[PDB]
């Protein structure tokens, strides 16, 4: 990366610290990767983390020169999921094909499938994007997560 944006990338990492001690954990790593510009699969992270469990995931520390090879290894990244894949991805539960699903199934599938969400993760994401029948139209929900 350019020392221009790498200066900025450093700052956001430093603003992730808890104390000042220079050490953002194997946990928060995922948010730093995000906040710089990424949307990693929690797997993409786990890959460069070195496969820890909750214990050393919480206990092991990172510093920036331990992080920057990670952020770099992802970034020039394999395949980035288009609008088209994603809509069909949510389209899955449209019992007929309609373009629409009930906001209850949609709140739930994200809390049961793939990289599972909490209710907190879902409500903020989905709410106010169901209509006056309680259907979330998926097409716009997909666009919403894109341009965000």
């Amino acid at each position: 990366f350019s020392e221009e944006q790498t200066a900025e990338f450093k700052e956001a990492f430093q603003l992730f610290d808890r104390t000042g001690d220079g050490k953002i954990l194997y946990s928060q790593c995922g948010d730093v990767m995000r906040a710089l510009g990424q949307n990693p699969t929690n797997a993409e992270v786990m890959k460069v983390l070195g496969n820890p469990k909750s214990d050393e995931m919480n206990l092991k520390t990172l510093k920036f020169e331990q992080f920057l090879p990670m952020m770099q290894t992802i970034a020039k990244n394999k395949d980035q999921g288009c609008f088209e894949d994603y809509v069909e991805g949510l389209r899955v539960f449209d019992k007929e094909g309609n373009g629409t699903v009930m906001g209850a199934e949609i709140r739930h599938v994200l809390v049961t499938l793939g990289e599972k969400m909490t209710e907190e993760e879902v409500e903020q994401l989905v709410a106010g994007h169901e209509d006056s029948n309680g259907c979330i139209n998926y097409e716009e929900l997909v666009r919403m997560v894109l341009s965000g």
Binding site: D94, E96, G97, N98, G99
Partner: protein, 313 residues
């Protein structure tokens, strides 16, 4: 986007209804062709009823009603489609007659403008009451809104029931010997028209494989699911097309007697489709059929412009 499995599995095996339960049959070559054919065409109709209301959806104290009649349709093979056309067409000469003579004078009389009422012997209502009228001796539509519902009833007996109810009526003329084909002429102003009656029953009825249809009802697409949500009406072993057309005809044509008329008295110069081609006898005929001599002797005396006088004072 209906169900792919079930389209053909309906179109070949109607898991249908005899009595009030589920009955299976394989369909014959013949049974399979005819039903799928109905499906092909019927989807375009379902489509138009969606479309014209999405048009008006964007387009809509006073109003100006205008009337584009798919109109005065004398082809050879004149089916039901062409009859009830030439019916509102029949009504529309009788709208001129009831307007530029009568209601144009009654727009003059809603005012009390100096108007001597002039009538010319041009009331056509008997030829309409022949096509229109439900009880007493029934009209062409009505007799079919009846014979839609009966098995031992036939496009043949449709015209036979018409020879039966009408006969003697001085606006009706039975065919030139074609019982065998069953057709009838009625004395529409602008020419005696031949209608032929074979297949009219199922035209004023519309039957289809209810199975594929109920799956078209449960479709994916907003269009197909809006277009086909009206499954209830399909018959397998409901209130007719034409009577529901009367439940709209009166919405066409009563509003018209609330509305002051303005007229467009449209002649055909040639029966050959053409640009520029007039015929000297063909126009002359329509100068009599559209009633020009007499249509003169009212509005020749009469007023194009209206605009309110108290304001004008």
């Amino acid at each position: 986007g209906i169900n792919v499995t079930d389209f053909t599995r309906s179109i070949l095996t109607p898991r249908i209804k005899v009595g009030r339960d589920v009955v299976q049959k394989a369909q014959t070559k013949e049974q399979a062709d005819f039903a799928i054919e109905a499906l092909a065409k019927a989807k375009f109709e379902r489509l138009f009823r969606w479309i014209l209301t999405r048009v008006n959806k964007a387009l809509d104290a006073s109003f100006l009603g205008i009337l584009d009649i798919a109109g005065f349709e004398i082809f050879e093979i004149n089916s039901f489609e062409q009859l009830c056309i030439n019916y509102t067409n029949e009504k529309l000469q009788q709208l001129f007659n009831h307007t530029m003579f009568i209601l144009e004078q009654e727009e003059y009389q809603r005012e009390g403008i100096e108007w001597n009422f002039i009538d010319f012997g041009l009331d056509l209502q008997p030829c309409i009451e022949l096509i229109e009228r439900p009880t007493n001796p029934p009209g062409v539509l009505a007799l079919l809104d009846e014979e839609c519902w009966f098995p031992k009833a036939t496009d043949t007996s449709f015209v036979e029931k018409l020879i039966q109810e009408q006969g003697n009526h001085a606006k009706f003329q039975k065919s030139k010997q074609l019982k065998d084909k069953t057709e009838f002429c009625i004395l529409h102003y602008a020419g005696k028209v031949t209608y032929n009656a074979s297949a009219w029953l199922t035209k004023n009825m519309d039957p289809l494989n209810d199975n594929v249809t109920s799956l078209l009802n449960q479709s994916s697409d907003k269009f197909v699911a809006d277009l086909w949500k009206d499954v209830d009406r399909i018959v397998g072993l409901f209130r007719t097309v034409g009577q529901l057309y009367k439940e709209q005809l009166t919405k066409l044509m009563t509003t018209l007697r609330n509305t002051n008329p303005n007229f467009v008295r449209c002649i055909i110069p040639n029966h050959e489709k053409r640009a520029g081609k007039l015929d000297a006898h063909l126009v002359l005929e329509q100068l009599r059929c559209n009633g020009v001599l007499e249509g003169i002797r009212i509005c020749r005396q009469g007023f194009p412009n209206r605009i309110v006088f108290q304001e004008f004072r």
